[PDB]
Structure formats: C-alpha cells, structure tokens
Structure 1
Amino acid sequence: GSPGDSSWHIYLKSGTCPFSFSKLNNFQKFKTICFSTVEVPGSCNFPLEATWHYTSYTIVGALYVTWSEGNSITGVPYPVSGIREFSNLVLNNCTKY
C-alpha cells in the first residue's frame, strides 16, 4: 500500500542476446519467438538485478528468449485499435522513416 519499494531499485541488465529489451517495440522483424522464464536449451537471457540506493548488487532472476530469422512477425510501439491495415506517413519536415 505505502510504497516501501521507494528505496529498492529493481531493473534489467543487458545479457548475451544480440538485441536489446527496450528496443523490441521498434520495428524489428523475426520469424517466431516464444518467451519463457524457465531454462530451455539454446536460449540467451536478460538478468535481473536488485539493489538498495545503489550500494551493493545482487542477481535475482532472468528472462529466457529464443528466436529464428524471418520477415513475418513485427514489433509495434503501441496497439492502435480500429485500423484495418497499419501504416503511417508524416510530410514536410524531418522524420525517421
């Protein structure tokens, strides 16, 4: 109720995967993924870290992820609802296409 978690800082690190966690929502293209939280052979990982005002560090858990290359499944920043076919176009000043 009262946030006793105001001092504890829990966050993700960067593991051995050849991409980042906060940039999967950009337009990255895969073939299949199947995330999991228990050990599966042939899978990289993102560790999970906990600390108290950034004095001492410890490792708590992980996030396990597989993939394969393709051009079928695509990440999206946010779920626009109502549109039958997703596209966007911004004219006349500088964008990131």
Structure 2
Amino acid sequence: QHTDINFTATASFGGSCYVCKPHQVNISLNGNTSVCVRTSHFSIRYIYNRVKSGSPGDSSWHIYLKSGTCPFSFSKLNNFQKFKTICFSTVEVPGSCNFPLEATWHYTSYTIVGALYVTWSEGNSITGVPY
C-alpha cells in the first residue's frame, strides 16, 4: 500500500520572555511518538502549526528543522530514495539519524526544541514517493 507520515510541530508562544523561546512545542509522528513504514511506498512531510495567541508576534516565530547527523536531507527522503527498514520517532532511539528542530523569533535567538529521529537499513523494498 502507501503510507503518509505527517511530522507536526505545534507551538504556543506566550510566557515570560515572549521573544526568547516558545512556551510549549508538541511534536508528533501521525499523532503518536513513533511510526515505522510498513508499506511499499511512503511519503513524509513536515507541518508547522502555531496556536492563536492574539498577537502578530506569532509569524515572526519560526520553527523549522535542520540538516542533521545523517546522509539524508528530509526533502531527499521523499524523492524516490530506497530503504529496507525506515522508522521515525520523536525521541532519541538507538543508532539514529537526527533532524534537529530549531525555533527562532524573527532570526534573533535560535533555540532547539526537539528533533526527528530516523532509523534505516538500506534496501530496495521501501520507496519514497514525493506526490
């Protein structure tokens, strides 16, 4: 079959120093902390979602991910790359690729708020379709 994985960061921004760090930032692989691709084809997209705060200071709040410790670019995963195993987790798991999740207020201070964890065994059984 084909599996979609939405990797979603949801963040709320108030608190003491509005500008210094986000208040809370929940991180989720499909509404769970862990997904293993078990289908022949898979897609993964990163979704950033702010909550309403009643302040246009939102949208100067950027949370995005970074090129991590591994030979993949997040965007390269979806572009017909091939694996035998591929699994995604929210929290550090053994022997993993790490895509760190940095947050920033309008490019002032940068402040890491989590990461996407990738585990893989090379093969020709699982494909990354971009559609």
For normalisation by structure 1, the TM-score amounts to 0.73
Structure 1 residue 39, shift from structure 2 partner:
2.0
1:5-25 C-alpha deviation (Å, 9 max, x unpaired) = 211011101111111001211
Structure 1 residue 41, shift from structure 2 partner:
1.2
1:61-95 C-alpha deviation (Å, 9 max, x unpaired) = 011110001111111111xxxxxxxxxxxxxxxxx
Higher CA-based Rg: 1
**SS of structure 2 residue aligned to 1:68:** strand
CA separation in 2, counterparts of 1:20 and 1:31? 18
1:13-45 C-alpha deviation (Å, 9 max, x unpaired) = 111111100121111011011111122111120
CA separation in 1, counterparts of 2:56 and 2:118? 31
Structure 1 residue 4, shift from structure 2 partner:
5.1
- Which has the larger strand fraction? 2
Structure 1 residue 3, shift from structure 2 partner:
6.4
The residue aligned with 1:70 is 123
* Identical aligned residues as a percent: 100
Structure 1 residue 2, shift from structure 2 partner:
7.3
The structure-2 alpha-carbon separation of the partners of 1:54 and 1:32, relative to structure 1 and needing over 3 Å to count, comes to same
The residue aligned with 2:8 is none
**Long gaps (5+) in structure 2:** 1-53
TM-align CA RMSD: 1.6
The structure-2 alpha-carbon separation of the partners of 1:13 and 1:39, relative to structure 1 and needing over 3 Å to count, comes to same
The residue aligned with 1:49 is 102
**Long gaps (5+) in structure 1:** 79-97
CA separation in 1, counterparts of 2:84 and 2:74? 17
Query: RCO higher in 1 or 2 (8 Å CA, sep ≥ 6)?
Result: 1
**SS of structure 1 residue aligned to 2:121:** coil
The structure-2 alpha-carbon separation of the partners of 1:53 and 1:2, relative to structure 1 and needing over 3 Å to count, comes to closer
